[PDB]
Symmetry: C2
Subunit: 331 residues, 2 copies
């Protein structure tokens, strides 16, 4: 079987908190919500791994960047654009970039520029589905907040919210608030930045674990994933469909999304994550040609097979994956 | 006590670097390795060089920007084209070069050669709130017929050349019915000359120059009318005026805006300012708006094109007071 097309959804690398802790005397050098140095290296290493699999092993892609063969699209965020660029430095490293005729390398160290296309979230025809916020809070309380598990988890924790509010300096009125605090505390642990003084190690771990749980609860309902990921999954199906049709130089599509993108797509496919996607996580759609006009799609999460209920495994026939996507999109 | 003038904000509109033709010549056996309408190796170096110049000015001399990239201080926006995206990225490799990139905590460089990633934001032309004003083809042809084809000069140049359209069409493999079609052929022929690509068999050296010269004339004619510029450039100029206005309030970290535009973007902006171009903007062309703090909440804007002062009739020079420029922009937008 021959690899003839691939789509990669990546999340961005290690980042600084969206929300700083007012009670902590620590400045994030990179600024808030920004890709860190480790974040860049993570994406670059993933780009290096992609070069090995798509260029050295399969020859899906040429050794040097060839216009028309790849399409790279990012969401409208510094961290996703810089993640795409870091990864692409791995896929097409310095030393592969072009040389002026009879001259020197065009850029220092023969770097290879690759266009990273983007659209504002409100105008994104490919990755981001923006929904009227009055309808998101209606979806959330219908399929997430109203559930027995959500209400019960908020109830066990909220007596601690006033203390946690005072110690973190962020008002926590509900589990939704606690989640943002947990995501921040976690980034704080990764980078061994100071924690709020007096906030207990047991509370730190409870708030962080609760934030991950709350994160996954919001991504898990297939009804939520259909609203948010139908547009993205329709575009991925159309790219895989075009890839089988032999007609274009395009062999590879790279979409620099976030953790919500990845969790939402896997949930859309009926394989919701129990755990938050680690930094530079990958959802891959690999299109295989059997030679007897039989096209299959292998779907992986960080290189691991995704068991899709509708397909009974990680491998779907191409038309079957397309119908799954259009069946989900029309709910 | 009394303070020297300080550069407190800048906006650059750049043209992309050297590119392959948009329209190839069917009759010439020369394949553009990069694909059509794409930035070449020479184009990347041109942008990188401009970036090195920008670093000297904005970083080493004025300290408008920090030595190492700081999120929030710079905003880079590109049109939705591979050539403008790759031009911005090449230039940024000059502005924040390998060696200024971040280090991981272990003290190793995050990327090879300590490369510094910089986000280049973009929108499709149809959805661009910053650079591109989209105009329906029919509305464009109405504007062309009112302000460009209506001139005696346009009609006279088309009538003097249209004799050779049948010959030139056969020789180029491109259909030419008018000066507008001819302009496309001349841009392509010019790119052939730049790269010493073969010219179409039988097309005379004199006819080459005439077509290239006619294409430049045709291009400047379409950009010249202020009414055309007001339609295409009102939105861009409004945003640039808002950027400068926000720079004067000095509440925001934003110090620098880079706009990866096209030759039309530059031509249309200068035409909008009442200083329409005579000559086609070369590759890696730059329109600069520099915001100066004169020390007592008096702010001036200097406008330059490729290092030369732009004479703005309404401002009576290259230097405008910030509100006067802001008013010029809004009165043009209200036409």
């Amino acid at each position: 079987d021959k690899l003839i097309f691939a789509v990669d959804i990546i999340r961005h690398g290690d980042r600084t908190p969206i929300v700083a802790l007012p009670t902590v005397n620590y400045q994030w050098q990179e600024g808030l919500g920004q890709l860190t140095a480790e974040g860049m290296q993570q994406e670059y290493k993933m780009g290096v791994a992609f070069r090995k699999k798509y260029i050295e092993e399969s020859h899906l892609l040429p050794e040097h960047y060839e216009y028309g063969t790849i399409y790279v699209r990012s969401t409208d965020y510094a961290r996703t654009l810089m993640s795409a660029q870091s990864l692409l430095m791995g896929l097409y490293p310095p030393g592969t970039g072009p040389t002026i005729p009879a001259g020197t390398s065009a850029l220092p160290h023969a770097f290879q520029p690759i266009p990273v296309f983007s659209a504002p979230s409100k105008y994104d025809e490919v990755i981001i589905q923006q929904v009227d916020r009055k309808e998101r809070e209606k979806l959330m309380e219908q399929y997430v907040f109203s559930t027995r598990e959500w209400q019960q988890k908020n109830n066990e924790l909220k007596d601690k919210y006033p203390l946690w509010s005072r110690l973190t300096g962020i008002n926590i009125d509900n589990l939704g608030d606690l989640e943002t605090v947990g995501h921040t505390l976690y980034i704080h642990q990764i980078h061994n930045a100071p924690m709020p003084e007096g906030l207990a190690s047991n509370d730190i771990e409870t708030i962080i674990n609760s934030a991950e749980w709350a994160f996954m609860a919001q991504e898990k309902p297939q009804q939520i994933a259909n609203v948010y990921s139908s547009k993205l999954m329709t575009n991925i199906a159309d790219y895989l469909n075009s890839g089988s049709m032999k007609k274009s130089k395009l062999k590879y599509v790279l979409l620099s999304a976030h953790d919500t993108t990845i969790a939402s797509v896997l949930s859309f496919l009926g394989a919701p994550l129990e755990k938050s996607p680690p930094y530079a996580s990958n959802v891959n759609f690999s299109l295989y040609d059997n030679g007897a006009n039989y096209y299959t799609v292998k779907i992986t999460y960080n290189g691991n097979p995704v068991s899709i209920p509708a397909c009974g495994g990680s491998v779907c026939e191409l038309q079957q994956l397309i119908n799954l996507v259009h069946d989900s999109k029309n709910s």
